[PDB]
Amino acid sequence: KTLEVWIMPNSPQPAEDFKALVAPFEKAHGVEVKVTVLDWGVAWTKITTAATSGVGPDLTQLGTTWVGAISAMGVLEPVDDVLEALGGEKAYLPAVWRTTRLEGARQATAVPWFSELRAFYYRTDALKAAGVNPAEMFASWQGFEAGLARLKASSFRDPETKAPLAPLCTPGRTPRTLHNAAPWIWGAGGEIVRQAGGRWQSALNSPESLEGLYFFLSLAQKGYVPAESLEKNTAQIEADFQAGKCAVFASGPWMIQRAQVPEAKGGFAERTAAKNLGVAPYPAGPKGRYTFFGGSNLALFNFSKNKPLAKELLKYLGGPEAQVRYAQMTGMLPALRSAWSDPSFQQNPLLRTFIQAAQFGRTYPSLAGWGGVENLAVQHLGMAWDLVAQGRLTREALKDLMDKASAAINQALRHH
Ligand SMILES: OC[C@H]1O[C@@H](O[C@H]2[C@H](O)[C@@H](O)[C@H](O[C@H]3[C@H](O)[C@@H](O)[C@H](O[C@H]4[C@H](O)[C@@H](O)[C@H](O)O[C@@H]4CO)O[C@@H]3CO)O[C@@H]2CO)[C@H](O)[C@@H](O)[C@@H]1O
């Protein structure tokens, strides 16, 4: 007997860690779990091709923001039974519960696996050298910009690179997601989409969304993000932070784990950044404090030939033992609320900051059209980063680009 599972790179050795996670299950049931690791860049294509073709695994990892879209194609097995066996609605943060289904759908189609949310890594040595108190820098938009100005004026040089650090690293290539931009949209009192009388519309071109997006993109145009960074993607910016080229960088809790792993094993423990590593929440914007809260769920294709066994594996991977173990392996947080209280998560001072930041966590709505909405948004946001790189992003040009984005998004949303 065989189960196939598709996962994304959640840990330093994704396949080996997942095999070690499921070895007790394999023994107890007399079964082999075969795993295939999909890059996040190609996962959507691979998963939607399995969905329409009927050729795929028994289980796939799904990003929380994708559950609605894949569920709407009618290809996922109901898993309300698994969720009831895991403790039902009360066993999960409501934000997590809402990712188990397409908004407004009758049955659940995904089991929560892990949660993640975004905060700022910072170089503790660089902020001390600049005279920046992270408590002031990360409290407010004004404190954020004031600390980036101090980091820009700093005479600090990395002790390995013998070079200055960039104040902020953020990618300017066409993003794959709005994860980096969302907290600035939200902090200004904006939204990506808004429901009015049942129907979803873009709000990327609202005055509030434009204020937040402009604030964020203009940090790079004011010189706090180097030119080189706007020609880089997330993976390259992450490597730059790890190699000691950036003072401040937004990411998920996984990087805490990677900071404790040797380079040999796909970590960065030997690097100065790992030994001078701090974490602070996103600053409060004028309409409050938000950060992106996501993670990944597991779903069972309705064409699987091993549904009963597959659901046993969903109950295993969703349950307390596997939930704590996999969070430990990945640096992610458990999707199961009770597992947050495990003392292993409360003892890393950096992870404790992620946990506290979850009070301001915000999710995308679970829409059928989400894949197309985010794809359309990031294509237009890619062009606004192109203007930034030329010093030509004006409020007017950003409004023009978000009006186009909003037309495209409203036209896609009318197709559901
Ligand atoms: O949008 C869909 C989905 O996104 C989820 O967020 C994902 C990001 O999409 C993804 O790009 C990000 O990828 C991380 C990966 O998790 C890490 O393991 C990896 O970390 C190491 C890695 O071990 C090495 O192999 C790699 O080469 O280098 C890095 C350096 O430390 O870093 C990548 C790149 O950022 O992971 C996110 C979390 O899963 C949301 O969570 C979800 O809600 C969305 O639906």
Ligand SMILES: O=S([O-])[O-]
């Ligand atoms: O940053 S100035 O263009 O508002």
Ligand SMILES: [Cl-]
């Ligand atoms: Cl961005």
Ligand SMILES: [Cl-]
């Ligand atoms: Cl939103």
